[PDB]
């Protein structure tokens, strides 16, 4: 059945709750972003109001074939009324089109649902600064102190410098980047830019990227693999067998692959700096795992919450085990006692 942490009290609303059938009493279904664990259930047969960003609405129409009459896109940073309740959508610093949702309840309670997010100090100067938030529905993906990672900017610097050096030493090397969802576009787009290439990809992935309102996209991507030296493949194909196979398909145009896997966290982070990352190599294939995260580190999450000072926190991630739930509740109490709220 629909879990309580997907329901917004005092409303008829749910958040990211499309795989439970008709949720009894739900008058509006919000979708925070286009990732499969969150949209699971949606299709052309859905006949209830879906409330989302413009970009998520493009993807629903084009990829899932949801009918237009049931897609209700909202502008960001704008007070809107939905079934008699004031709401605002905020940028979540996740993947393209991802939002947080502020609900202003008729009784005066204010609720923030972060969806999936990477907390950032820039959020401290949005419409969130303007009133108190009582309840926070929190993306707790990496809510443990072991989870450190570098800035996205540091990671992209490493990737750009590594790719440019490789291809300049060997003009016959091919760069490959893995993907299995929207997000993390900066990785392959930044590398393509430094090399003076477009990124080549399948027709399905090109279609998906053409829904994202990214500026000058027609200048950065292509379905013509022959004209491109940065290729995108399914994440599943980023291994030695899958890459050897891909290299055969390129007909002796290339004699080396440098591949990138933009993972979330991996336990090389507890020890190793970005400067010190090394690839796994077999023959003329090298694979780099790089820690490009679109979720908050522990310290970023902690700073956001200690700034916001919510009265109650409802975790939305890692809620399935008692040991996880209890650990998270201990951190929330530490944060509250350190900061004084
Ligand atoms: Ni997500």
Q: What are phi and psi of 249, to 5 degrees?
A: -55, -20
Q: How far is the CA of 172 from the centre of ligand 1 (A)?
A: 36
Query: Measured in angstroms, how far is the CA atom of residue 171 from the centroid of ligand 1?
Result: 36
How far is ligand 1, taken at its centre, from the CA of residue 113, in Å? 14
What's the Cα-to-Cα distance from 287 to each of 85, 163, 172, 229, rounded to whole Å? 50, 12, 17, 16
Work out the angle between the directed axes of helices 185-195 and 152-169 (0-180°, nearest 10).
40
Domain identity same for 333 and 300: yes
Q: Distance from the CA of 167 to the center of ligand 1, in angstroms? A: 33
Distance CA 204, CA 195 (A): 24
Distance 56 CA to ligand 1 centre (A): 12
- For tokens 């190599």, name the residue: 281
Structural domains counted in the chain: 2
Q: What is the whole-number distance in angstroms between the Cα of residue 127 and the centre of ligand 1?
A: 23
Distance in angstroms (rounded) separating the CA atoms of residues 200 and 233: 9
Residues 152 and 290 grouped into a single domain:
yes
Long-range Cβ pairs for the range 267-272 (8 Å, 24+) = 269/146, 269/147, 269/148, 269/149, 270/146, 270/148
> 3-state secondary structure string, 46-91?
CCCCEEECHHHHHHHHHCCCCCHHHEEECCCCCCEEECCEEEEEEE
Distances (CA, A) of 240 to 52, 237, 253: 39, 8, 19
Separation of alpha carbons 189 and 209, rounded Å: 11
User: 10 Å Cβ neighbour count for 315?
Assistant: 19
Q: Are residues 276 and 175 in the same domain?
A: yes
- 301 and 291 fall within a common domain: no
Which residues make Cβ contacts (< 8 Å) with residue 75, sequence separation at least 6? Answer: 54, 89
- Encoded tokens for 213: 């309102």
Q: State in Å: Cα 35 to ligand 1 middle.
A: 5
Domain range for 36 is 1-147+296-341
Q: Looking at the structure, tell me whether residues 80 and 139 fall in a common domain.
A: yes
For residues 95 and 172, membership in a common domain is answered with no
How close is the Cα of 116 to the center of ligand 1, in Å? 5
Please tell me whether residues 247 and 161 are part of one structural domain. Answer: yes
Question: Residues 195, 199, 204, CA angle at the centre, nearest 5°?
Answer: 175
Task: Note whether 69 and 175 are same-domain residues.
Answer: no
DSSP string, 261-280: EEES--TTTTT--GGG---E
Residues 79 and 169 both lie in one domain: no
CA of residue 314 to ligand 1 center, whole Å: 17
Among 263, 279, 295, identify where a domain stops: 295
Q: Give the Å distance between the CA of 83 and the centre of ligand 1.
A: 27
Distance in Å, CA 121 to ligand 1 centroid: 20
- CA–CA distance, 94 with 91 (Å, rounded to integer): 8
Long-range contacts of 82-89 (CB under 8 A, 24+ apart): 82/13, 82/28, 82/51, 83/11, 83/12, 83/13, 83/27, 83/28, 85/11, 85/13, 87/51, 88/127, 89/53
CATH number at residue 199: 3.40.50.12650
| 183 CA → ligand 1 middle, Å | 8
Distance 189 CA to ligand 1 centre (A): 20
Question: What does 212-259 look like in DSSP terms, one character per residue?
Answer: S--TTGGGTEES-GGG-SEEEEEGGG-SHHHHHHHHHHTTTS-SEEEE
The last residue of a domain, from among 261, 280, 295: 295
Question: How far is Cα 226 from Cα 51, in angstroms, rounded to an integer?
Answer: 40
Same domain? For 92 and 170 the reply is no
From ligand 1's centre to the CA of 62, what distance in Å? 19
């Amino acid at each position: 059945t629909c879990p309580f942490y997907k329901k917004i009290p005092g409303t008829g609303f749910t958040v990211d709750a499309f795989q439970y059938g008709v949720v009894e009493g739900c008058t509006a279904y919000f979708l925070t972003h286009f990732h499969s664990d969150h949209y699971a259930g949606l299709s052309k047969h859905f006949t209830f109001p879906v409330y989302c960003s413009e970009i998520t609405g493009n993807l629903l129409k084009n990829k899932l074939h949801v009918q237009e009459q049931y897609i209700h896109p909202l502008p960001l940073d704008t007070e809107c009324i939905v079934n008699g309740v004031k709401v605002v959508l905020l940028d979540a610093n996740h993947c393209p089109g991802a939002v947080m949702i502020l609900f202003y309840l008729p009784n005066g309670t204010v609720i923030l649902h972060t969806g999936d997010f990477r907390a950032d100090p820039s959020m401290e100067r949005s419409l969130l600064a303007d009133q108190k938030v009582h309840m926070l529905y929190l993306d707790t993906t990496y809510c443990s102190p072991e989870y450190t990672f570098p800035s996205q900017q540091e990671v992209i610097r490493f990737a750009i410098n590594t790719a440019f050096e490789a291809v300049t030493l060997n003009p016959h090397a091919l760069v490959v980047c893995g993907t299995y969802s929207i997000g993390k576009e900066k990785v392959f787009l930044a590398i393509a830019d430094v090399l003076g290439s477009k990124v080549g990809m399948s027709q399905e992935k090109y279609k998906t990227l053409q829904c994202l309102n990214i500026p000058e996209i027609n200048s950065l991507i292509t379905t013509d693999m022959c004209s491109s030296l940065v290729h995108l493949l399914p994440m599943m194909q980023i291994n030695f067998k899958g890459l050897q196979s891909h290299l055969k398909k390129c007909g002796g145009k290339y004699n080396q692959i440098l591949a990138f896997r933009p993972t979330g966290w991996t336990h090389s982070n507890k020890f190793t700096r970005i400067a010190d990352v090394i690839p796994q190599t077999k023959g003329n294939i090298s694979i780099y795992g790089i820690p490009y995260s679109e979720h908050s580190s522990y310290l970023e999450m902690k700073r956001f919450v200690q700034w916001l000072k919510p009265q109650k926190i409802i975790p939305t991630v890692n809620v399935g085990t008692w040991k996880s739930r209890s650990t998270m509740e201990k951190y929330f109490r530490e944060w509250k006692l350190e900061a004084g709220y």
